[PDB]
From Swiss-Prot, chain B:
Origin: domain of life: Eukaryota
Record protein name field: V-type proton ATPase 116 kDa subunit a 1
Residue numbers on the Vacuolar membrane side: 112-113, 176-239, 299-343
Role summary: Subunit of the V0 complex of vacuolar(H+)-ATPase (V-ATPase), a multisubunit enzyme composed of a peripheral complex (V1) that hydrolyzes ATP and a membrane integral complex (V0) that translocates protons. V-ATPase is responsible for the acidification of various organelles, such as lysosomes, endosomes, the trans-Golgi network, and secretory granules, including synaptic vesicles. In certain cell types, can be exported to the plasma membrane, where it is involved in the acidification of the extracellular environment. Required for assembly and activity of the vacuolar ATPase.
Modified positions (Phosphothreonine) in chain numbering: 64
Compartment annotation: Cytoplasmic vesicle, Clathrin-coated vesicle membrane; Cytoplasmic vesicle, Secretory vesicle, Synaptic vesicle membrane; Melanosome
Transmembrane segments: 93-111, 114-130, 146-175, 240-259, 278-298, 344-363
Gene (name only): Atp6v0a1
Stretch of the intact protein here: 297 to 667 of 838
Subunit and partners: V-ATPase is a heteromultimeric enzyme made up of two complexes: the ATP-hydrolytic V1 complex and the proton translocation V0 complex. The V1 complex consists of three catalytic AB heterodimers that form a heterohexamer, three peripheral stalks each consisting of EG heterodimers, one central rotor including subunits D and F, and the regulatory subunits C and H. The proton translocation complex V0 consists of the proton transport subunit a, a ring of proteolipid subunits c9c'', rotary subunit d, subunits e and f, and the accessory subunits ATP6AP1/Ac45 and ATP6AP2/PRR. Interacts with SPAAR.
Topological region Cytoplasmic: 131-145, 260-277
UniProt record similarity statement: Belongs to the V-ATPase 116 kDa subunit family.
Record-listed Phosphotyrosine modification sites: 68
From Swiss-Prot, chains C, D, E:
Assembly mode: V-ATPase is a heteromultimeric enzyme made up of two complexes: the ATP-hydrolytic V1 complex and the proton translocation V0 complex. The V1 complex consists of three catalytic AB heterodimers that form a heterohexamer, three peripheral stalks each consisting of EG heterodimers, one central rotor including subunits D and F, and the regulatory subunits C and H. The proton translocation complex V0 consists of the proton transport subunit a, a ring of proteolipid subunits c9c'', rotary subunit d, subunits e and f, and the accessory subunits ATP6AP1/Ac45 and ATP6AP2/PRR.
Post-translational modification: Ubiquitinated by RNF182, leading to its degradation via the ubiquitin-proteasome pathway.
Primary location recorded for the protein, binned into one broad class: membrane
Keywords annotated in UniProt: Cytoplasmic vesicle, Hydrogen ion transport, Ion transport, Membrane, Synapse, Transmembrane, Transmembrane helix, Transport, Ubl conjugation
Lineage, opening ranks: Eukaryota, Metazoa, Chordata, Craniata, Vertebrata
Gene Ontology biological-process annotations: negative regulation of autophagic cell death; positive regulation of ERK1 and ERK2 cascade; positive regulation of Wnt signaling pathway; synaptic vesicle lumen acidification
GO molecular function, one term: ubiquitin protein ligase binding
Any one GO cellular component localisation term in the record: clathrin-coated vesicle membrane
Organism of derivation: Rattus norvegicus (Rat)
Gene giving rise to this polypeptide: Atp6v0c
Sequence intervals crossing the membrane: 6-28, 51-71, 88-109, 127-147
Membrane topology note: Multi-pass membrane protein
InterPro entries attached to this UniProt entry: ATPase_proteolipid_c-like_dom, ATPase_proteolipid_csu, ATPase_proteolipid_su_C_euk, F/V-ATP_Csub_sf
PANTHER family linked: V-TYPE PROTON ATPASE PROTEOLIPID SUBUNIT (PTHR10263)
Name used for this protein in its record: V-type proton ATPase 16 kDa proteolipid subunit c
Swiss-Prot record, chain F:
Subcellular location: Membrane; Cytoplasmic vesicle, Clathrin-coated vesicle membrane; Cytoplasmic vesicle, Secretory vesicle, Synaptic vesicle membrane
Role of this protein: Subunit of the V0 complex of vacuolar(H+)-ATPase (V-ATPase), a multisubunit enzyme composed of a peripheral complex (V1) that hydrolyzes ATP and a membrane integral complex (V0) that translocates protons. V-ATPase is responsible for acidifying and maintaining the pH of intracellular compartments and in some cell types, is targeted to the plasma membrane, where it is responsible for acidifying the extracellular environment.
InterPro entries, sorted: ATPase_V0-cplx_e1/e2_su, ATPase_V0-cplx_e1/e2_su_met
Gene Ontology molecular function: any one: proton-transporting ATPase activity, rotational mechanism
Gene assigned in the entry: Atp6v0e2
The protein, known as: V-type proton ATPase subunit e 2
Membrane topology: Multi-pass membrane protein
Membership in a protein family: Belongs to the V-ATPase e1/e2 subunit family.
Predominant subcellular localization, coarse grouping: membrane
Upper lineage: Eukaryota, Metazoa, Chordata, Craniata, Vertebrata
Keyword Transmembrane among UniProt keywords: yes
Cytoplasmic side: 26-32
Amino acid sequence: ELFRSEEMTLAQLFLQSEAAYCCVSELEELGKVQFRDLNPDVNVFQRKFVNEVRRCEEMDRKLRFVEKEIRKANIPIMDTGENPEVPFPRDMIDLEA
Amino acid sequence: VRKMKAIYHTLNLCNIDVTQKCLIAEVWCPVTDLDSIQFALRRGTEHSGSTVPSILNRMQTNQTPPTYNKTNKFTHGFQNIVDAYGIGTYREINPAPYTVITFPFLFAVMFGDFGHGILMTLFAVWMVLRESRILSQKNENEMFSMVFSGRYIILLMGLFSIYTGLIYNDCFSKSLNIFGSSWSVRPMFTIGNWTEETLLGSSVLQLNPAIPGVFGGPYPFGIDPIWNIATNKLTFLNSFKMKMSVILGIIHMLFGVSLSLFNHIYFKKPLNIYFGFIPEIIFMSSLFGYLVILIFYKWTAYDAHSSRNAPSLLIHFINMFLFSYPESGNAMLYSGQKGIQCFLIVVAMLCVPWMLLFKPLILRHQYLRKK
Amino acid sequence: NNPEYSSFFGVMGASSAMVFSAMGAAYGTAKSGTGIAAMSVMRPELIMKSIIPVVMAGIIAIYGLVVAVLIANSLTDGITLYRSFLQLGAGLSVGLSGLAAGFAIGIVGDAGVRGTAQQPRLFVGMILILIFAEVLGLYGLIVALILSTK
Amino acid sequence: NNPEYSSFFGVMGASSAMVFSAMGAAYGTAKSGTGIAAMSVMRPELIMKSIIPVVMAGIIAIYGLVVAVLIANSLTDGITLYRSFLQLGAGLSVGLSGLAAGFAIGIVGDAGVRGTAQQPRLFVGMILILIFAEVLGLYGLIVALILSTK
Amino acid sequence: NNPEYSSFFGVMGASSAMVFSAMGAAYGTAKSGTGIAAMSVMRPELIMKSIIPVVMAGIIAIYGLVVAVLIANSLTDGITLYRSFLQLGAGLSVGLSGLAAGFAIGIVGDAGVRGTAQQPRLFVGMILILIFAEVLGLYGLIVALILSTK
Amino acid sequence: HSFALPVIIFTTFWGLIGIAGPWFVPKGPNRGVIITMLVATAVCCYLFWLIAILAQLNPLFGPQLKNETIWYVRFLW
Amino acid sequence: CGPKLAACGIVLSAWGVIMLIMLGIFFNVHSAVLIEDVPFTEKDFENGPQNIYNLYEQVSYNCFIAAGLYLLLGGFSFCQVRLN
Amino acid sequence: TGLELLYLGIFVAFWACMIVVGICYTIFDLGFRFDVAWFLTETSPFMWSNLGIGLAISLSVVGAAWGIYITGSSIIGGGVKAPRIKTKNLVSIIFCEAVAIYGIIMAIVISNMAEPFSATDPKAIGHRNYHAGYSMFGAGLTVGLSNLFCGVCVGIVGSGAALADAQNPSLFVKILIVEIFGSAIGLFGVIVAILQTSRVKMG
């Protein structure tokens, strides 16, 4: 009850890799959890998903590039609706293409 | 892309040892929403070719968790201004719900104008009424972002500032004509006695001493309208706002030590109650109680026909705290008051060693015994 | 009867209460406002939070105002000279103590703000030290209330 | 009845209201107008926004003028020595509070404008801090209005 | 009868007790508060221990408050000139001694805080150094209590 | 007649707000906050007004008035 | 004009009318607190309250007229805020 | 440093005495001493007059001296690398001499209005004689100090013109306008000093 600081719970879990992406995404869609950092050694080449994030970093630069061209051209970005994440399957490669 | 980047960045906080098949992960969740995250895990597996529900164990060998509070429109700004000084300890009593009233209250007690109360109310109302529009707009005007993000806190304090401003009977040093008055019309001074002063008034300033028969009797509203126009008004208004602010301060400090007890109860700490709260509240209460008591006693025991040679409140409080009354000058207010003055101070002085040293000493013995 | 010059010392009471307090609050605001301006350069986030010393220095002007008004509204032609010396004593007891407090708020506000730029944890420490600066105006107010009503 | 020399103090009030607020507003304009010039070379856009310290420095001289005129209209060939001291008090209490406010407007204006040139987010903080400086003139004006009308 | 000016030295006593103690506490707070702020970057954990010089500076203003209040409580229009000189002596005795104690607390605090961050062992020493500063406010008080009660 | 009746009116008004108000609050996460709001409002607002009226009782001195006002208080009330 | 001036004129219109009508009322009830606002003279103490009552009417009209200018500012600004 | 701390030390010690003395003569009921009426009567009108005359010259000459050396030392310095400087920029010195000339014009006038009294009691001396003394003082002080400032100004801006002309020949003709505005200050210090003197007569 809000007259005091809320009761939390620390928990440990066995996240199956093929579920992991989906689970993280659903948890971020819920927005009611804080992950612990379990990698004190985390760095640009020490991070377990270097490539996956680096692809996102570049795809974001590609988005920014095409967006700047569109905004210079003043072509209307439609900005309609709201959307889910990509599948865990490798469909991000078709998006990168 | 942005979601995907974030997802993989969160996955990068997980661990995978060299043999490791699954991903080990850890979270803080609200105890109330342990089920909600387990549902999200099961659904996350069900959105995948996996069958493994990825279920958690509750941890016991725990460091102190991060502190969370749920918030909404009428409460978020109040939590933010509390968090801005510091984040409460886990399970600690939260200032924010008490703050939802008391911050607006202290603001309005200071900001005591009826018309400014209206203008503040109108300003915040126009932000709340336009809210659904404004939420779509630019944020790069930081002043506009701040005042809009404060809209609920600002409205509340504005409303309370009407309330305080009304009781102070003042907008822009103007009264409201809603109240009656205890002030006396010129005919009441013409009663043979003092009738000459009504003629002197054609040429010179004069003071009403509030004497019986002439005075318009004890007043039932807030501040009497007359002090807005009166030349000596600041003396009267100050006696109020000084004594009032002192009283409110004592009250708020007595609430804070009372909250300390309940916080120490929730943490189950006998030492903090016994060596902290008890001697502390006795110290505070013995010093503070007499002051407030004597302020109320002056307001009841003295009046116009006893006003000359009435004692100073502040002098008796100082001479209590310093034992320094010279048996002379200002009159004592009630029978045995000297004994009470001595007693309450000595009782507060007796609290100090419990706070200062006896806790450290019993703690030293406990640590020497716990071997 | 009562000496003709008597109200001069009561006036200097009211004047000193406002004047030296405005010098104190001006120093406080000048030094801390400089520290805020220099700190803002690489800290857009801290600019609002850092106003603490500036507004607190303003309090010393108000303690000066309180005593100055309290004296000024208590003046009269007939003033007993003793009451005028009480009013000088009051007007200096706040006024110069507010000058002292304003010095402390100016130096502390400047340093505290710059240190908070370097290390955001200092924000609490800055508030606490500024309280031990600001209370010097308040003690000057207490004495000046006691004197101006003795 | 009243000393012929009596009006001398009340004249020093009218004078000192204007004199020390002119010094305050001059320093406030001098210090901040040095900063505006130095800034404008890098940020030609900020000139019109950066004038505000100078405008508030002007306002301090207006508080001087207000009391100076209020006293100079109140003076007379036989003024009661009490009212002559009350007027000296009003003059010093706006005048030197104006000086203090002008010092604060000066320092805050210079620092604030240069800081704004390096960080446009400072502008909001600078205006707030400048009001906390400029109001010291207004607090001096309050006491001076009280004393001159008491 | 007692001369009507006799209260002047009494109220200057109360003023000097307050004012010079607030000046000492302000300087002791300003230097140590600069020390804390400049230290915080390298040793953020030391802020809460480092307040002690600031607290002891605050205490010096409390010594001045106490004596200024005791003096004020003892004033009357009819005061015998002897007692008013005692009150001046008490006022200066605490007030300037607290100025001295405050000067020491300022210098010791700034050196003591900056030293402690480079070497924690200094703390045990600098608290004792600060005691040997703060006791000057206590001696000034003791003399002022004696004098103001003869 | 006594001032005690106005006191008891304000006392009762805030007492209902600080007791019966809570006893009409709905069920949901905001309940503790709303109860605290009602209670703390009644407590502080009762005390603020109570102290203001208590200081207004038994006035030790009346108004000082300007020459002009001392004439107009013949007619304007 | 622009939207900024129209938004200013809306807020000024609202607060100006609200306050000036309250003053117009307080003047028309001849309330004792208001004396310092009235531009009376030494002759206005002759005969009785009729002279001061006429001034309370004139000054009440000043506020109603000024509130009328704030109503005109209102109507103009409620057009301009939509037009700009 | 040293002499500024000595001038400040004397200045603070003086005003620290004067605050205390002014308080003492008020609170001890001694307003029958501090008789400024005595100071302004028994101090001879000839003293106020002759300080006025002496300062009317000497302060004008002090302002013209700084006038000369501030512009002159720049004329010389630029003149090494730009010999053209040593004639055209001399007009700034001529305006510094003109500030001294304004001194001597005014001080000869005031001097040639002084005459002996043949009386020594303030009643017999009388208002005309006192008003001559005080007027000749204030006039002589006003031309003296106004020329002091004017001469320093024209000096400063004469170095102005000279150091600029050393780098571009055309600038001097346009910069010369500021020297005219500087020089007007000394002339204002004459016009008012004439008016302050214009109605006096001793006897």
